[PDB]
Amino acid sequence: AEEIEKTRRRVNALEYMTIPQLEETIYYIKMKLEENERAEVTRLIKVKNM
């Protein structure tokens, strides 16, 4: 019974905190490099047009 609670805590903590924090982070990380990539591409066109 005691160990059920420990395991139940771990499952809950893993499902509610760990995993969603991972998913939402990789999205915000993906968006960053998505913007950074094309923010440079525009600059490069300026270099091209010198």
Partner 1 sequence: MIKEYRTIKEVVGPLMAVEKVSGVKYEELIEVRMQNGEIRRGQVLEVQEDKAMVQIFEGTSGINLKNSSVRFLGHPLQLGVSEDMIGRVFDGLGRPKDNGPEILPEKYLDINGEVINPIARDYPDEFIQTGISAIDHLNTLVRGQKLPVFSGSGLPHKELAAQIARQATVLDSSDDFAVVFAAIGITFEEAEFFMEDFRQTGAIDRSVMFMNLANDPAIERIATPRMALTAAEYLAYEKGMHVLVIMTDMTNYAEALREISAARREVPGRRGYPGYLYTNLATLFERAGRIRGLKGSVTQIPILTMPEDDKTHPIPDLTGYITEGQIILTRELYKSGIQPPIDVLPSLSRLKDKGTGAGKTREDHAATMNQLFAAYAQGKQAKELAVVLGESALSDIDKIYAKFAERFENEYVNQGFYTNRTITETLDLGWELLAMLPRTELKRIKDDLLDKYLP
Partner 2 sequence: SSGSSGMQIGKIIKVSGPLVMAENMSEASIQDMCLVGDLGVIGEIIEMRQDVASIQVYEETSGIGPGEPVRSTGEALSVELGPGIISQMFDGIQRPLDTFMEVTQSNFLGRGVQLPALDHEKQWWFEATIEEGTEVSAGDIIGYVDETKIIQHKIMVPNGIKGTVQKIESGSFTIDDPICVIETEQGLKELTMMQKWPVRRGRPIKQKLNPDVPMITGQRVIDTFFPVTKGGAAAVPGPFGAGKTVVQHQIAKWSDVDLVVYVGCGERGNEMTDVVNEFPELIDPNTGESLMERTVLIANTSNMPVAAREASIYTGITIAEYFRDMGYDVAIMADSTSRWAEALREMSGRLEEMPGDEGYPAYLGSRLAEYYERSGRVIALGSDQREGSITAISAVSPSGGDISEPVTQNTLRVVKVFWGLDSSLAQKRHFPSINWIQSYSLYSTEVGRYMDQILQQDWSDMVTEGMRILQEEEQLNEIVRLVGIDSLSDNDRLTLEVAKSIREDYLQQNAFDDVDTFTSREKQFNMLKVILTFGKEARKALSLGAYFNEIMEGTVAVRERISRSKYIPEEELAKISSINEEIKETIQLIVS
* Interface ranges with partner 2 (CB under 8 A): 9, 12-13, 16-17, 39, 43, 46
Q: For residue 49, report the phi and psi dihedrals to the nearest 5 degrees.
A: -95, 35
Q: Is 10 a binder of partner 1 (CB under 8 A)?
A: yes
At residue 42, the 3 state secondary structure works out as: helix
Does 48 help bind partner 1 (rule: CB under 8 A)?
Answer: no
Binding mask 27-46 for partner 1 (x = CB under 8 A): --------x--x---xx--x
The string of DSSP letters for 9-40 reads HHHHHIIIIIHHHHHHHHHHHHHHHHHHHHHH
Chain positions contacting partner 1, by CB under 8 A: 6, 9-10, 13, 17, 35, 38, 42-43, 46-47, 50
